[PDB]
Design a protein around this nucleic acid. Sequence first.
DNA 1: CGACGGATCC
DNA 2: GCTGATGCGC
DNA 3: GGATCCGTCGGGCGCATCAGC
Length: 276
Amino acid sequence: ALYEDPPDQKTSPSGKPATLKICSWNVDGLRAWIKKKGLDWVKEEAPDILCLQETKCSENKLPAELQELPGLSHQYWSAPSDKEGYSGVGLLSRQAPLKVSYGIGDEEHDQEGRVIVAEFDSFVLVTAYVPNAGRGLVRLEYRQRWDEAFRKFLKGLASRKPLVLCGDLNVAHEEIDLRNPKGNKKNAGFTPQERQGFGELLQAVPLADSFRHLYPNTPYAYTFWTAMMNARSKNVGWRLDYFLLSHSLLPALCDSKIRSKALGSDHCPITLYLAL
DNA sequence: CGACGGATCC
DNA sequence: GCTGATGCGC
DNA sequence: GGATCCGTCGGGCGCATCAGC
Ligand SMILES: [Mn+2]
């Protein structure tokens, strides 16, 4: 029931060494995460690109430590427009992207600081903090509209350039992706509509779930544990955080990691190795 | 959203 | 202008 | 009585505003 992520596979299936290391982390409050030493872990992980979700922090209030990241110089941020203190995403990059945009090209879905798009030479990186359907499923209908628009946006992106989508997609795709599937069939994150949404995304773009592609039969691998129930200590969790890849990037896939041991949030980090 | 308790069936 | 109480969104 | 299925609900974070000093 407890889980230990296998060691880092650093070469591609054809032997090419990894050249790109991307780390994604819902930090449950950027300023608190930094207080709990989250950036010390980042320095030890040394990613080429760091995506952050649920920063809950406007660009004006970003801590100063973020300016002391010598290898993550190019920092892009997005915050909600209506009010402060919820959602928010960041993208920090060792090299400058050719182009950075925000949102998914749809007004209704572009107000809550949820999506950053960074275009590199040979691939485009999207990081996302997917809207929660809420206690009582009060936002379920909205989440279904989000799912369809996100899917159409990413399908268009992937048709122009190979795509990496990372971050908190806020859904456990299959029963293997959470510890309590039958008790959660009507809870945000595991409704049949959200799981069907995820499935259509995989098929329609198409995209491959990098972790599940490499470890199709591995249960108890989670990236989130609720903070109240001290569920983390007993590994009662959900896999909400993903790297989804264009099929053309699969021969470059070296590994997709779940950094279970890294503290600082109610999500743990995930790390992608690509041999580009 | 996991712990809990109630309801239904055996 | 400061702090605690309270509410929102996970 | 136990075993399966479900519906209810308390609890707690990181953040905000604001009413009270
Ligand atoms: Mn969260």
